[model samples]
Target: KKPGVGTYATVDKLKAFDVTDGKKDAFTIKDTVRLYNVEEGKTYAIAGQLYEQSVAGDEGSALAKAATTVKVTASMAKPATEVEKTKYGEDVKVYETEMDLTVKREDLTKNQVVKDDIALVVYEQLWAEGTYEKVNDTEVTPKGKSEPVAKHNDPQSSSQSITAEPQFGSLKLTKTVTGWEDAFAKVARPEASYKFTVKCVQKGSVDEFTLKEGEEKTVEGIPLGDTCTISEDVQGAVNQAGLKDTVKFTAVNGVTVDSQVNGEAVVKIGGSDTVANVEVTAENSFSY
Candidate 1:
């Protein structure tokens, strides 16, 4: 079995590489990129390739070529006397080597890395350089002295990083009442539009929209462990004691909804350990 060292698969991927060019040096990738375990002193670089495991002996064929001769000395510790030797040759000094990587919604979609509207596919491993070498098709070996790159050890060598972002979900609201359908036969109550406030409490973000019958809006970029609520503007006409009616709130595809209150619905997103997306629906109806 293959092995490597890496951060837990819960956080985002590497965002920017913080290295020392004898000065605090750094560079940026796609906005989706996230980083982790950033320590005080260390050297960091980028390296990995996409592979197709489904085809026999096709492991050698890389869908994409990845490499990082580019490296930077971290600021975690005081610079050592010996300069850090990177693929770029003798470079800055680094003491700590812990970090992570992550991606954003716009980038993932642009790269076509997500499927089923909710599942995100990530290619793994930003391996340590000159760490593991395959002797042949059946055997693996630790490569000899090109001098093992520091922190380029097993487990971390095989380890992967990922970030889950808000994808997409559906939300709907319905209103039902007894004899109201019959009453409507005599008088026409055209579908009415009401303003709605949808808030992601955990994220501290909110969106307002006017909702009407048969209208479903998709919510995106919801972070994991975030809670959301939807409330309508029509409480006076929709909420009353002894009124034979009900308003329903439902969440599907990776989100949970509590019971409805007045004209509001509360939802909690799932997948605390991974990225997730949710669809929701809220309806208010009255009856005589």
Candidate 2:
């Protein structure tokens, strides 16, 4: 009920009755009362109560402390809704564009997108060791311009993207031995041990390996277009066997062998941008 126009009414709490249980439930009355028709901007007390144990308990065991109190000052009424305002600058007309660029090797062996998702591809070129050489004299125009962009003569200026192919080749050598019986026979008895040296020559560089009968070896990482020779120390091997008078060895140049002879082989690397696998075989025959 409304209080008289000039007066105020205090709101208070009373114990509530449970409808289903038909029993009175324990409750607390507020320490600070709420007043209707009260003036704003005044100091007042804000309060609430706390229970020691909130769960079910005997009325004798249940205990409650006094309502907690906080002091506050009243404020004027606020509007039902709020509004905010902001100002923005005027839209101006401007031109914007983008370009993508790719870099590739001259041989077209490798390529990559050097510049993408950009307003303009920008870079500088400088003269340094092992730099790529430009292949095109063609000019390009910017998005907003009509005149062709001039190219700088200085090697230090890199205005455009570049693509370059590097030089490389792969070389491999596989060596195998033939005439295992003649080699073993030179030992004169079972379990007799012997080893022979095989020499490979490429570009004035030599690599050697010592192996027994029916053994194989390999060499790799030679440059492209290299002429390599595979030669065995057959005479030295014969002398080591102590059968230099009974067994003789010779150098064979071809891919296949039918006689028991000892020799070296020759091969070349790289006709195209590829690898070479050369096979060398050494054979031993009687010194007939």
Candidate 3:
């Protein structure tokens, strides 16, 4: 029942999904994403839906779902036109292909068929900015997230319409209070009320606030290409519980970093191509 054609394998170029051994493979993730079903020049996500199965006349129903892969579009396989008479005498649509297809694993649908029938596997796709932009099912307001799109089980078609444009996404700021709690809990609030100085990418907009332990803050409606810097102000490390520590940077997204400035991290807007947001989590451990 192996159809002549089926959806291709979708995989991330840079992440390790199911088999994350040190020797798996090395690849780089792009910063931008494709906005599906829209007019060109928009946004896209991290999860690639891979479909792998043994030769199956049953179609890909018995695929071994396992699963990054890369961003560059792989050449699509050729499509063949075929028709089968279902319950009624009318001919139903079917397809066939000899070449391999590369479809995003997250985009896989039911009833799809390929000569290989493919073994299915899934994995986490990593991005350089640590975030992937996801396409909106429909274009709406400049600031809201679109509803999750539904996937169809179409067997005769495989083209996805696409459009892309830089968009307004949310920007986040966060901090972590390292392990000084053994003694610093005595003055829980002050010891780690990491007040950060946020400087916007578009000149003159600045913010100052504290992201206390286990907390974060956000500025919504931020567009792509925007940037900000986050530097934890010095409040003099506590003298007790061997609490002498320093502030530095941890994992972050959106843009890159520059430390010489009062802020330790200079965030740029990568506007999550997958999330429709630009996020920054500037952190440092102050463990005693």
Candidate 4:
């Protein structure tokens, strides 16, 4: 048995901070996700939030201009030795200035408030972060300090800040023979395009191809022309052959299919090739 097979699975997850459309320091709406282990009949919960910009002002209203009064004075006099002032009027001119300068000029000052939007991400801690074990699983000595090598549950190391592990890396698991009901997984919001491949096998002798949802193909795949659909009598063809046949349904190379919140996808078999029978594959996966 492989020990600590995926012990670091939680540590290698991709950082999804870039997928956020909001701000980090702004106000946010929180969303909590409850992950259920369908087979175990248990629930594991995790939480995250979506943030928006907040209009809170800074420390003080210092952006406004302060009100300060201006002062001025005028000089008036004649030369002491009867020396006439060459640049000024010699006579005792009215040495007075206009009184229009005393007004504090009603200052109507306003400051610009910054408008910024941020995306704040906070990962909640997983209950299994610290004390989790898998029988033959290697126990983490210093906890999340590093991956464990043997079996035992240890508290997180003082240096390690325990929190929900980012769901970033690829998770690989040997296909289990036991059947699973429903699995709920989370990952970063992907680009408009990405995909997963699904495979199927027969336990005994099964005919009629039952295609899974989220399958697709381009107009180019059809034999007739750009437009095509699965043969209407594919079920009859399988019955006529009296044998199971496999056919792959793929999404168009550049085509980005739209999806809903629950990640449910419906596969439509269509193309230019309409002459032959199209046997649908029984299972498939979505890849990135």
Per-prediction CA RMSD (Å) = 15.0, 35.4, 19.7, 32.2
Off by over 4 Å in 2: 1-204, 241-262, 271-275
| Global lDDT scores for all candidate models | 0.40, 0.29, 0.38, 0.21
TM-score of 4: 0.15
Error of 2 at 143 (Å): 20
Model 1: lDDT of residue 259: 62
Off by over 4 Å in 4: 1-28, 36-112, 122-288
Q: Name the better of 2 and 3 by TM-score.
A: 3
Which scores greater on TM-score, model 1 or model 3?
A: 1
Best by TM-score: 1
* Residue ranges of candidate 3 with Cα displaced over 4 Å: 1-166, 184-186, 189-192, 236-242, 252-255, 258-263, 271-276
263 Cα displacement, candidate 3 (Å): 5.4
lDDT of 3 by residue, 111-187 (tens): 22111122333212212212334323211222243322312223222221111112344567766556566655445
TM-score of 1: 0.38
Candidate 2 lDDT at 247 equals 28
Task: Estimate, for each residue in 29-81, the C-alpha lDDT of model 2 and write its tens digit.
Answer: 22222222223332222111111222212233212222111122344222221
> How close to the true structure is residue 141 of candidate 2, measured as C-alpha lDDT?
19
Model 2: what TM-score? 0.33
Cα lDDT tens digits, model 1, 178-281, are 33353333323344454678887755678888655556665665544456787766553343322344566665555567764667778755332332456666
